[PDB]
Enzyme design. Structure first.
Site, short mmCIF file in Angstrom:
data_model
loop_
_atom_site.label_atom_id
_atom_site.label_comp_id
_atom_site.label_asym_id
_atom_site.label_seq_id
_atom_site.Cartn_x
_atom_site.Cartn_y
_atom_site.Cartn_z
N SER A 149 42.91 43.97 50.14
CA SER A 149 43.09 43.62 48.71
C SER A 149 44.56 43.37 48.38
O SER A 149 44.83 42.93 47.25
CB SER A 149 42.60 44.67 47.77
OG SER A 149 41.17 44.73 47.79
N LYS A 157 46.20 40.39 46.47
CA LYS A 157 46.02 40.15 45.01
C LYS A 157 47.36 40.23 44.27
O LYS A 157 47.49 39.57 43.24
CB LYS A 157 45.00 41.15 44.45
CG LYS A 157 43.58 40.88 44.92
CD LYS A 157 42.63 42.01 44.64
CE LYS A 157 41.22 41.71 45.12
NZ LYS A 157 40.42 42.93 45.35
N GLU A 164 35.16 38.46 51.78
CA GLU A 164 34.97 37.88 53.14
C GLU A 164 36.26 37.97 53.97
O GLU A 164 36.23 37.49 55.12
CB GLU A 164 34.46 36.45 53.03
CG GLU A 164 33.10 36.34 52.37
CD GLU A 164 32.48 34.95 52.42
OE1 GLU A 164 33.14 34.03 52.93
OE2 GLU A 164 31.34 34.80 51.93
N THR A 214 47.90 48.08 46.50
CA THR A 214 47.23 48.65 47.69
C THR A 214 46.29 47.61 48.32
O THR A 214 45.90 46.61 47.68
CB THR A 214 46.41 49.89 47.30
OG1 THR A 214 45.40 49.48 46.37
CG2 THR A 214 47.23 51.00 46.70
C1 LIG Z 1 40.71 45.91 48.57
O1 LIG Z 1 41.38 46.30 49.51
N1 LIG Z 1 39.40 46.14 48.38
C2 LIG Z 1 38.71 47.14 49.19
C3 LIG Z 1 37.67 46.44 50.07
N2 LIG Z 1 37.00 47.46 50.86
O2 LIG Z 1 38.32 45.52 50.95
C4 LIG Z 1 36.68 45.67 49.18
C5 LIG Z 1 37.41 44.72 48.23
C6 LIG Z 1 38.51 45.43 47.45
C7 LIG Z 1 37.94 46.32 46.34
O3 LIG Z 1 36.89 46.02 45.78
N3 LIG Z 1 38.59 47.44 46.01
C8 LIG Z 1 38.14 48.31 44.93
C9 LIG Z 1 39.24 49.26 44.48
C10 LIG Z 1 38.76 50.17 43.36
N4 LIG Z 1 37.55 50.90 43.76
C11 LIG Z 1 36.48 50.01 44.23
C12 LIG Z 1 36.93 49.11 45.36
#
Ligand SMILES: *C(=O)N1C[C@](N)(O)CC[C@H]1C(=O)NC1CCNCC1
Length: 263
Positions: free
Chosen positions: A43, A46, A141, A208
């Site tokens: 993530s 972003k 993805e 993060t």
């Molecule tokens: C970002 O890193 N991220 C986590 C993931 N596992 O890759 C899925 C997509 C994204 C995300 O949805 N993070 C959220 C952060 C807050 N809590 C729910 C998940």
């Protein structure tokens, strides 16, 4: 490398690899550990996405103020802000704050569409001199974090250098730089990462990322120590097995060693 020994012990205890870059913008001092190795963005893309949208907003009058009137088809798991405003829509500014501060996936994907997709964000990063950053997927993805896959990766050093250019340098015009800094300062997802490593008096902005698989998670931050020029740093982790667990504690511990190693 005696400076490196505590980082090597930390990643060995963790069961994987940790990548760290930290720059004191006051001294020019740095701390580096696997700083030019690739790690999955997860993530963390972003933050750069929001910066690329701010750059576009400089010449596209009212872009940040534009209401985006999206449908349910735009929604993605973990889009808690986008789901709430599904009736009224959200401005590009509101989508940017949601993507940065809550990791809202629908908001991130709507902003990627504004840029011409992952390729558009990659092109923005090339335009500020970042040759390492690679993104080629939309949420959800880009998160497979497969060892040796250079797709959807950057390096701790390239992340730190790009973050410095956008938050402190001249890559954005000042009103846009200021908005990016305020979005990062309002992040809600990083309290157990770099924020846990810094003295409570210091201001922090961060984004993060957490793929979870292959022990993969990260954080990058600008840190404002009392009475000093800011520090910019990035901490990325990965591990060789798909079921290896990420650790927020290991990211905080690596961030403490980075701050302790600065000249
Ligand atoms: C970002 O890193 N991220 C986590 C993931 N596992 O890759 C899925 C997509 C994204 C995300 O949805 N993070 C959220 C952060 C807050 N809590 C729910 C998940």
């Amino acid at each position: 490398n005696l400076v490196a020994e505590p980082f090597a012990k930390l990643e060995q205890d963790f069961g994987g690899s940790i990548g760290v870059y930290a720059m004191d913008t006051g001294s020019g001092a740095t701390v580096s550990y696997r700083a030019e190795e690739r790690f999955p963005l997860c993530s963390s893309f972003k933050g750069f996405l929001a910066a690329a949208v701010l750059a576009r907003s400089q010449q596209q009058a009212g872009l940040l103020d534009t209401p985006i009137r999206y449908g349910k088809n735009a929604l993605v798991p973990w889009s808690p802000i986008s789901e709430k405003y599904l009736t009224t829509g959200m401005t590009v500014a509101e989508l940017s704050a949601a993507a940065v501060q809550y990791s809202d996936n629908a908001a991130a994907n709507l902003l990627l569409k504004e840029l011409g997709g992952p390729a558009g964000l990659t092109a923005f990063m090339r335009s500020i001199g970042d040759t390492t950053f690679r993104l080629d997927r939309w949420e959800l993805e880009l998160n497979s974090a497969i060892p040796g896959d250079a797709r959807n990766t950057s390096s701790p050093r390239a992340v730190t250098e790009s973050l410095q250019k956008l938050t402190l340098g001249s890559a954005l015009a000042a009103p846009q730089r200021q908005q990016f800094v305020d979005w990062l300062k309002g992040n809600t997802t990083g309290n157990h990462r770099i924020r846990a490593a810094v003295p409570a008096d210091w201001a922090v902005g961060d984004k993060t990322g957490t793929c979870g698989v292959y022990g993969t998670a990260n954080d990058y931050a600008v840190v404002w120590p009392t009475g000093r020029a800011p520090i910019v740093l990035a901490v990325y982790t990965r591990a060789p097995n798909k079921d290896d667990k990420h650790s927020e504690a290991v990211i905080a511990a690596a961030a403490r060693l980075a701050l302790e190693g600065l000249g």
